[PDB]
Amino acid sequence: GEFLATTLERIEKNFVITDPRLPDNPIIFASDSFLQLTEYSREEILGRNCRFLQGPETDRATVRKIRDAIDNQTEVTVQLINYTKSGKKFWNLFHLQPMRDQKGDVQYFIGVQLDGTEHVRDAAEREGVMLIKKTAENIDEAAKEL
């Protein structure tokens, strides 16, 4: 289809990269795993703000925590309900962090999504956060020279 995956997007992890310089801080890279989870083609995702994954059962208090993290250029880890193109529900253990350039200025935001069947706690939450934080650090390396 349109927008053949870059090597970055073939990394075998669920992530997106946004560019805050573009209108509504939209997705510029989306991994193949993200595509498969959400059911959008890449051409349907690019240039859109990620909020299209939200729907009726998404907790708006949780969404505001993400908005505040982006505004304060800082990391956050939350869990929220998201929906596929066909309106299918999933829990999203989500981690955001900025990617900084060699002057320390925010160049991109990196988002890592761990989909699940339920809100997680205790060991499942800890193991999930371990995985998405390690992934985010990996994408910080992978995205630095884009």
Ligand SMILES: Cc1cc2nc3c(=O)[nH]c(=O)nc-3n(C[C@H](O)[C@H](O)[C@H](O)COP(=O)(O)O)c2cc1C
């Ligand atoms: C890198 C990145 C990835 C994001 N991934 C998702 C996502 O997977 N699911 C989601 O519901 N929102 C996601 N968001 C959050 C929304 O894009 C948006 O920031 C949020 O809805 C708060 O802003 P708003 O109040 O303008 O909607 C992501 C944001 C960024 C910067």
Ligand SMILES: [Ca+2]
């Ligand atoms: Ca999973």
Ligand SMILES: [Ca+2]
């Ligand atoms: Ca799932």
Ligand SMILES: [Cl-]
């Ligand atoms: Cl949360």
Ligand SMILES: [Cl-]
């Ligand atoms: Cl659990």
